[PDB]
C-alpha cells in the first residue's frame, strides 16, 4: 500500500503545483493592475496636496 499512497500523494502535489503556479501568474497580472491604479491616483493626490 506504500506505493499506492505515495502515488496518491504525488498526484495531489502535482495538482497543488498547478494551482499555485496559476495563482502566481494571476498575481503577477494583479500587481500590474494595482501599480497602474496607484499611478492613476497619483495626479489628483499631487494637485490636492498643492
Amino acid at each position: 500500500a506504500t506505493l499506492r499512497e505515495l502515488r496518491g500523494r504525488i498526484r495531489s502535489a502535482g495538482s497543488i503545483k498547478k494551482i499555485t503556479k496559476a495563482q502566481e501568474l494571476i498575481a503577477t497580472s494583479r500587481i500590474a493592475k494595482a501599480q497602474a491604479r496607484v499611478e492613476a491616483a497619483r495626479p489628483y493626490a499631487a494637485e490636492i496636496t498643492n
Binding site: 501568474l25 494571476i26 494583479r30
Partner: protein, 222 residues
Amino acid sequence: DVFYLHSRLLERCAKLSDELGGGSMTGLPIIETKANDISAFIPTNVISITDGQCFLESDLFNQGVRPAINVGVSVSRVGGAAQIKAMKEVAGSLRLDLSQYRELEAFAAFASDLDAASKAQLDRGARLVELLKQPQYSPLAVEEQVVAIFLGTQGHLDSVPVEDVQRFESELLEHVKASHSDIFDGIRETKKLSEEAEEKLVSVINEFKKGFQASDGSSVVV
C-alpha cells in the same frame, strides 16, 4: 522468454513488399494495466515491441472524454505516412492546440487576466476536446472525420458553445451528406480537400450556422 513470446507473435504483422504480393497484416494488441501501471513487466515489453500506443485512462473516461485516449502520451511512430493528405493537413494543428490547452486548463476561471491569444487557445482547446468525443459503435468515414476536424481546426466551432459542439458536428455531417455529398466525394476519391471544395464547405457551414439552434438559444452565427 515471455518477451520472445510476444515479440515473435507481433513481428508477423508486417507490410509485405510488392514482390511478395503487397499484402499486409495490422496488429491491434490489447494490454490491460493495473492501477495505470504501464511500467509493469508485460506492458513494458509490449510497449517496446509495438510501433505506437493508444493509452486509455479511467479518469478521462469518467470525465466524459470517450474514447478515453490520452492524446498527451499516445504516439504513432508511423505518423503522417498512415494518413491521407486531407487528414494530415487538417489534423496538423491538433497536437499543439491540445497541448497548449492542457497547459492553460489551470487558468480556466481567470479569462480576464488571460491575454486575447491565450483565451483563444483555451476556448479552441475546449472545442477540440469536445470534438474528439465519439459514441460507441459509430465509426466515421475518413471524409466525415476530415470535415469534422476541419470544423474544429478552422475556427468554425468558435461561435458554438462547448455543450453543443458534438451535436452541431453530427448535424452538420448529416446536412452535408444530405445535400452536399460532393464534398465527401471529392475528399474520398481525391484524398485531399481542394480549394473549391474548401470554400463550398465554408459556405455550407455558414448557412447551417444560420440554421443551427444552440441549446441555450444563443446564435452561433459568425
